[PDB]
Amino acid sequence: LVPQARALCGLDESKAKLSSDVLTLLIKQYCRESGVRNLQKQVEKVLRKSAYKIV
């Protein structure tokens, strides 16, 4: 998911690093469901806000 969405957004590792512990937090808190869609949106939002913040 992470490499895919990052390629989709054109961001880069070392420009938008996410510690795995952060991811553990994101899943522990914000998405707790059988699918892997809802989480997909969370981690895309996580990119896009940073992307606007940088660009």
Binding site: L8, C9, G10, A51, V55
Partner: protein, 55 residues
Amino acid sequence: QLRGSTQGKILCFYGPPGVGKTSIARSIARALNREYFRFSVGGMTDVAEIKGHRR
């Protein structure tokens, strides 16, 4: 603008009626410059309307 070529996405809104949910669309389309079009679907039931016939 960051990743060059244009892209498209799908998303939705919800709140009390009359809050401006529909007014914003036309301004947005004139902002991004995509062509506007709307067509209310509510109460429709014919799938063929959105998929045509066998020709």
